[PDB]
Design a protein around this nucleic acid. Sequence first.
DNA 1: GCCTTGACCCTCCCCTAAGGGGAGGGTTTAGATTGTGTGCAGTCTGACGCGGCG
RNA 2: GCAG
DNA 3: CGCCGCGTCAGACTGCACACAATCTAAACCCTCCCCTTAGGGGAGGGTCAAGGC
Length: 268
Amino acid sequence: SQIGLFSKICRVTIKTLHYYNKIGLLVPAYINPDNGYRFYTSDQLMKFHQIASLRQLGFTITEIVTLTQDENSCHIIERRRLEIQKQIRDMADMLSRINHYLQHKKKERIMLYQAALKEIPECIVYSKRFIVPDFSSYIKLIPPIGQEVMKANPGLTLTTPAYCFTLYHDKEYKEKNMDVEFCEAVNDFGKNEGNIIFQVIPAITAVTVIHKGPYDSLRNAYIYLMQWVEDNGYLLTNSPRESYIDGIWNKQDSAEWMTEIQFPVEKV
DNA sequence: GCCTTGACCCTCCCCTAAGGGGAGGGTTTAGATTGTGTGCAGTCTGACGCGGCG
RNA sequence: GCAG
DNA sequence: CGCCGCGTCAGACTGCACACAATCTAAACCCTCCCCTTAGGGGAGGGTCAAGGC
Ligand code: 118
Ligand SMILES: [Mg+2]
């Protein structure tokens, strides 16, 4: 059976048979030496059937070489079983994500906020946890802390890139009784004089959305994020953070400012 | 100024998986056919040299 | 096709 | 040795403008080699940037 007839028997292209010969997966029975023409037999169709049966299960080519040459190799198929289970979980989450994205673009003509699930590493921060009467009053008392901590810790260099955020330790919603904890990441340990202390903040996977503009609309992102958090079945494992990209330090106009709200979540 | 020095950074080349697509090369084709035809140009005269040829 |  | 046929060799110089050539046919197989597809990784080769000491 010449390669054309055989390629139509097994119903696959010629280049596929060329490739399977090139990698040594399916070798013709008899190659004519001067022309190089490949001729197969029935016992090449018998092997191509096994090859295609394994290849419909997603096995990579080298995995098929091993599956056909090494017997009692059930650990590689089980490994592939676990990987396929992981991709099914991931694809179902993707389904929920794309349903929510389509649900939004029909709900609003503009996508104001996209939600990204990113991993944030562990940090070394100086932290002050305290009650706040008003979030507007919360903004002013931070540069005093900036003076104070650099005073008490000489030569303490903050991490680059700068990570300056807020934990919201409140389990429900209110506007004037916010129990917050301001954390900012530095390089080394330090002195703990004052309400300012040092602590290690563990690495977390968190869904974050970046809101750009003034802070009075920031709650929007939270409602959105909360929707997201409930829609895709994620569970909020820790208190929500808010990391400051743009603000009074870089830029003077308060409408081009930008913060990023981060929800610590776990997949359940 | 004269140097070093570690940290960055750019471009470019090749690599990934499983083949697709094409370029550019080979090979055989088993009824039997068996001598080129342009509706060609040919149309320029005079001098000179050389060679068959009686 | 033309010019001298 | 003298003559006729045949072949070869020439045929003003500058300029513009215009403008070439135009018909004329195989197909079905196979092979190798090259470049391409994702979403960036890895690394050689070669600049560049603040810092510091001489
Ligand atoms: C110590 C404490 C706070 C700030 Sb900053 C800041 C943070 C990261 C990168 C750049 C600046 C600040 C504010 C105003 C003027 C100058 C600096 C800051 C304040 C509040 C919330 C988040 C960050 C700086 C040092
Ligand atoms: Mg003329």
